[PDB]
Each structure stands twice: as C-alpha cells, then as structure tokens.
Write a protein that binds this ligand. Sequence first.
Ligand SMILES: [Mg+2]
Ligand SMILES: [Mg+2]
Lengths: 218, 218
Amino acid sequence: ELAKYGLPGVAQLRSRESYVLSYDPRTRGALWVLEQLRPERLRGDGDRSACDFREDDSVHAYHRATNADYRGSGFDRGALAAAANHRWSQRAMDDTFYLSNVAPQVPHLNQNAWNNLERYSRSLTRTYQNVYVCTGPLFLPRTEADGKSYVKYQVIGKNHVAVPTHFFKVLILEAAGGQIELRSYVMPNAPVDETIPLERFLVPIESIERASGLLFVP
Amino acid sequence: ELAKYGLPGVAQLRSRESYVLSYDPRTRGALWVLEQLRPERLRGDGDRSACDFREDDSVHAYHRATNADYRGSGFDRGALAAAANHRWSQRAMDDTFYLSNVAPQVPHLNQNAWNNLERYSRSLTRTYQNVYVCTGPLFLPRTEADGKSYVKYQVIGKNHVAVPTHFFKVLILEAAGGQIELRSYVMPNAPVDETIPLERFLVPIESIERASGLLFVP
Ligand SMILES: [Mg+2]
Ligand SMILES: [Mg+2]
C-alpha cells in the first residue's frame, strides 16, 4: 500500500464553541475562521482578561504558536474571531483566546481600525437576521527594482510565526428575507487611519479568493 | 452548525497512479508528494517529452498553475515526483507531468544536483525492498539588516506561483527484513555544485517537520 505508513499532511480543522477554523502549520496561524453572529446572541454574560491567551495543545508543538513568540515582538495578539462577538457564554468566549485564533497584528490596527470594522460587523447584525463572518490573513506579492514580484512577510518568535501583510473579512448577511448581501474587506497590516471610511477598503471577493486560496461563491 | 454554507477551505489531496500529493491553493503548488519506489518494476518502457506539462483540471482555476506562469520566468518546471521514477506505465509517468506536481526550480539545480539526488534515490532500490520518497518545497526565513527574520520568495506568472527557497526530500528506506531507516535532504533553490557529495545536504527530519508544517515519523 502507498499509505503503508501514513501521510505527512493533516487537514487541520478545528470546530470550537464559538467558531470553526482551518489551521496552517507552516504559518503557525489559521487560514480562515468563520463565525455566525446573530443578534439575540452577541451581548451576554462572561469576560476574560485582555491578555489571557493560550497556546493550542491540539496543534503539534512543532507548529504551535506560543505567547513567548509574541513576547517582545511589537505585535498584538490579534484575534480573528473577535472576543466581543461571543460575550454570549464564558468558554464560548474562552475558545477565542486560543492562539489558533490569533495572528500577529500591528497594535494600532488591532485597537482602532480593524476594531471599527469589528464594530461594523457587530452593527450590521441589526439589519439582517443572521450575519456570518469569515476572517483570515493575506500574504500579498510586491515588486522590487528588478521587476520581479516577491511575497515578503515578517517571522517572529523561535517558532517562526508568520506576520500577515494583510487581513480579509467577508460577511454574508442574512436569514430574514431574500439572501443576497456579500461584503468583502481587506486592510494592510499597518497603522491605517481610523478616519478613512470603512468602504474605501471594500474589495471584490475573487480578489480575495485568488489571493487566499479559498472559495466563497457558494 | 455555523457550517450552513459549507467551508471556504478545501483540503486538497490528489491520488494519481504514481503518487499521492497534497495541494496548496495559495502557493499554487503541492505541499508534498509521496512516491513508493520498488526495486525495478518502476523502470519499464514509458517515455514522454521532457517539457510536455499539463495544467491540472482537478484544481479550481483561481488557484491553479499554468504553463504561461512559467514561460518567461527563467525557472524550470521541476517535477517533485520524478518522471524517471515511473517508466513502469505510460500513465504512471503521464501523471508526473501534471503541474500540480511541479514547482518553479532553478534550471541548473533541476538538471545537475537535484537530478543526482533522485538518481541516488532510484539507486538505493538495490538494497531495500521498498524506498518511499516524499518531496516538497520549503519557504525558509532569513535574517536581515534590522535583526528580524523574514520569509521572502518570488512569485511568477499572473497566478502568482510561489518560487520555493528550498526543497526537501525524505527517504523511508524499508529493508527487506522490515527494518525502516530514515534520511532527509534539503537543498537550496539555487545552482549548487553537483560535485559536492550528497552527504552534505543531510538534515534532521524534525527540521523539515518544523519548517514545512508536516509530520513524517511513522
Ligand atoms: Mg484584537
Ligand atoms: Mg526535475
């Protein structure tokens, strides 16, 4: 048999209380995380200190981000499935502090501009019955003086956790009616101004689908 | 439950007559390719023109490598599963010319030193009843002027096909008496001296396992 000893590659799905993620052991962070925020269900009892992030013991130690990797890095532990999205229940929001839900994020971006869009998705849960949000990183290519195009991203910690160049957020908004409503955003991993209107970052989703390796048109 | 709209990330395993691969839609290349070389049966009468490659149709057109991506790159279409490994059957060799089995490779490496390593793998079908080979790319970080580590690789064509910085090859040498011995090689995607003994590119498998995100030890 060709599979006599096992295949080296894992399809690394995780389904937590609060989201589903697909994990990439090479980047030491998630490919995508999808949550369904419904209203009804956002605001609730439960909280946790802003810094109580935990490594994921379901990920092999070879490919597992640790708090030490972020230590001294200048990057926030930016959660993709946001914490205030799941104040519904306690470990429903404890699952959002696993480092599998986290990518190195420029702190000004984590606290102001990505934060405003997190609010926007939390505001749009108001016009539509159900709001599904899928979030993840981008590593976008970039030319230099020689004319050739390069992907270049920073790598932090001894475990070499990748710092994304960009992040995407795609929302498909509905149950209560007829169900069109797809909206796609991308911001660079950089101190982007809070003043810029949120929709200056709208992008067609195949932009994201080609770059990310994922397919969203279902 | 939130999976009501499927998942955007499909794990990608193809099984051809000659190998199992696992595909990466973001790099537009295989994460690994798994062959089982057996002492002679896989050297028969098959043959194929050396540049006759097919773009894979089992991969969505947003994430697939094409021959136009390679055309002006300066890079060889280096087959990870070697074509000479499967003279056994015409289809077993035609499978190795799928572009999903191919990564951008510096042509001097493809034809002198990587070639010697594959000729070395085919050789060791002397001593061992079975020789398993797993080949794949590596994207290794390098340290820059500012003291930070970055992963930097070129992308070619307008599907942005990742140019690996290194290549790994793992030999699982099954001796006739059941005994299995392990061997691991990493060579840079560069013109490297074919006169250097292949012994100098030996590396520990945990090193490939931490860099690639794969787990090999059976
Ligand atoms: Mg945050
Ligand atoms: Mg070759």
